[PDB]
Write an enzyme that holds these catalytic residues in place. Structure first.
Site, PDB file in Angstrom:
ATOM      1  N   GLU A  54      43.598  67.096  84.066  1.00  0.00           N
ATOM      2  CA  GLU A  54      43.464  67.525  85.459  1.00  0.00           C
ATOM      3  C   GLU A  54      44.682  68.274  85.955  1.00  0.00           C
ATOM      4  O   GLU A  54      45.803  67.994  85.527  1.00  0.00           O
ATOM      5  CB  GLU A  54      43.072  66.414  86.383  1.00  0.00           C
ATOM      6  CG  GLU A  54      44.114  65.380  86.503  1.00  0.00           C
ATOM      7  CD  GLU A  54      43.890  64.475  87.699  1.00  0.00           C
ATOM      8  OE1 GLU A  54      44.054  64.989  88.769  1.00  0.00           O
ATOM      9  OE2 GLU A  54      43.470  63.339  87.526  1.00  0.00           O
ATOM     10  N   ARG A  65      48.789  66.217  97.144  1.00  0.00           N
ATOM     11  CA  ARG A  65      47.858  66.992  96.302  1.00  0.00           C
ATOM     12  C   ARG A  65      46.539  67.315  96.879  1.00  0.00           C
ATOM     13  O   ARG A  65      45.801  68.107  96.304  1.00  0.00           O
ATOM     14  CB  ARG A  65      47.637  66.300  94.970  1.00  0.00           C
ATOM     15  CG  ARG A  65      48.830  66.183  94.091  1.00  0.00           C
ATOM     16  CD  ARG A  65      48.512  65.304  92.791  1.00  0.00           C
ATOM     17  NE  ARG A  65      47.686  66.100  91.908  1.00  0.00           N
ATOM     18  CZ  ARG A  65      46.912  65.635  90.973  1.00  0.00           C
ATOM     19  NH1 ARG A  65      46.675  64.363  90.842  1.00  0.00           N
ATOM     20  NH2 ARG A  65      46.322  66.481  90.151  1.00  0.00           N
ATOM     21  N   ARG A  69      40.878  70.004  92.709  1.00  0.00           N
ATOM     22  CA  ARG A  69      41.380  69.910  91.330  1.00  0.00           C
ATOM     23  C   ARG A  69      40.540  70.783  90.433  1.00  0.00           C
ATOM     24  O   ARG A  69      39.396  71.075  90.675  1.00  0.00           O
ATOM     25  CB  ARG A  69      41.244  68.483  90.765  1.00  0.00           C
ATOM     26  CG  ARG A  69      41.778  67.386  91.637  1.00  0.00           C
ATOM     27  CD  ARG A  69      43.256  67.151  91.461  1.00  0.00           C
ATOM     28  NE  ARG A  69      43.708  66.063  92.262  1.00  0.00           N
ATOM     29  CZ  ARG A  69      44.022  66.115  93.522  1.00  0.00           C
ATOM     30  NH1 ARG A  69      44.045  67.250  94.160  1.00  0.00           N
ATOM     31  NH2 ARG A  69      44.441  65.021  94.165  1.00  0.00           N
ATOM     32  N   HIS A  85      37.795  65.488  95.810  1.00  0.00           N
ATOM     33  CA  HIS A  85      38.571  64.422  95.264  1.00  0.00           C
ATOM     34  C   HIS A  85      37.696  63.651  94.241  1.00  0.00           C
ATOM     35  O   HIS A  85      37.598  62.400  94.277  1.00  0.00           O
ATOM     36  CB  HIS A  85      39.001  63.485  96.451  1.00  0.00           C
ATOM     37  CG  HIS A  85      40.187  62.716  96.101  1.00  0.00           C
ATOM     38  ND1 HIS A  85      40.136  61.546  95.414  1.00  0.00           N
ATOM     39  CD2 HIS A  85      41.478  62.870  96.449  1.00  0.00           C
ATOM     40  CE1 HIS A  85      41.348  61.033  95.318  1.00  0.00           C
ATOM     41  NE2 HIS A  85      42.173  61.847  95.901  1.00  0.00           N
TER      42      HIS A  85
END
Length: 96
Positions: A54, A65, A69, A85
Site C-alpha cells: 500500500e 494519511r 490509497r 479507507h
C-alpha cells in the site's frame, strides 16, 4: 469484491503522483508507503502474503494519511484505488 475499473485520469491527480513514485521505487512521503497490505478483510482477490503493498494518495490539506490509497499487486499493472479507507477499491487503468 472489486468495484470495477477506473481510468487514472478520473482519479484525483495525487493518484498519478503516487503511481509515479511507485514507478521510481520512491522515495515516498509517508513511512507506511510500501508496506505489505494484508488484504485482511478479503476485499481484494486472495493472494499470498506480500503480493499486495500500500501507498498513500495524499489528500490536500490533510495532516494525516487520510483515506486515499493505492494498493499494488505484484501482477502487471495491477493497482487498486481506494478513497474510503480500504472499504472499497477499483482497479486503476493507466491507459486512460
Amino acid at each position: 469484491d472489486v468495484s470495477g475499473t477506473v481510468c487514472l485520469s478520473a482519479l484525483p491527480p495525487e493518484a498519478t503522483d503516487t503511481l509515479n513514485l511507485i514507478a521510481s521505487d520512491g522515495p515516498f512521503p509517508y513511512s507506511q508507503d510500501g508496506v505489505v497490505f494484508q488484504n485482511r478483510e478479503s476485499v481484494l482477490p486472495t493472494q499470498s502474503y506480500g503480493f499486495y503493498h500500500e501507498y498513500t494518495v495524499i489528500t490536500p490539506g490533510a495532516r494525516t494519511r487520510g483515506t486515499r490509497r493505492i494498493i499494488t499487486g505484484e501482477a502487471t499493472q495491477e493497482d487498486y484505488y481506494t478513497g474510503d479507507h480500504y472499504a472499497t477499491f477499483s482497479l486503476i487503468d493507466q491507459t486512460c
